Amino acid sequence: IRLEIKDEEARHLSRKFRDWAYGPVYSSLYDLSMLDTCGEEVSVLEILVYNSKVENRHEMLAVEPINELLRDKWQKFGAVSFYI
């Protein structure tokens, strides 16, 4: 997930990026390549929840993008699905 390669030829497969660095504020950029598979077979996040029976899944959800990725779709779908 934290994959940023300096080699500049294996760059198109790098995962972490740096958008803009205006002083104190850094703008990182994570790819949702397999995290939220919209029209694909099966996702990373689905196996984190539906398939993995390992104890470490509590820690494994506490990685950087997924703590904010889950807050994305919660803010868009939580208030709607509750009201229904």
Added chain:
Amino acid sequence: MFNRHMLFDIVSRGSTAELEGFLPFLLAQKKRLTDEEFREASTGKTCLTKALMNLNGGKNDTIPMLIDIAEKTGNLREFINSPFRDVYYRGQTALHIAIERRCKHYVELLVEKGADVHAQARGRFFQPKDEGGYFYFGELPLSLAACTNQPDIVHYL
């Protein structure tokens, strides 16, 4: 070349030898550096503002040269003091950018040629987080230099 797209590139390239003969070229076609077209129609980003964005180790030799070309046209208080014309990055000048990237050598160059100290970067980006912006500093370059953990500009201002 003779267009704007060549000029906005080479400044980011930082090759002053590829910018030769343009000061007599404005003598021919009577054009100012910030007349209509050598400035972004969406934002207002000029050549000097573009010069401070892309840096070569924090050094671009076009920066005194763009002031030099502006001196012959007579826009030293205009080519430096032209803020952004957009809404989101509204009011940001080249003085705000040079303080931002800690070009202490270039901060001294702007004011000596004439720079508005009290230019307010009052854009929607420069608002606090409750208002929709990402970074707040009170819209002032003196306050900006204090917010960038740099007292050296603070001594200079």
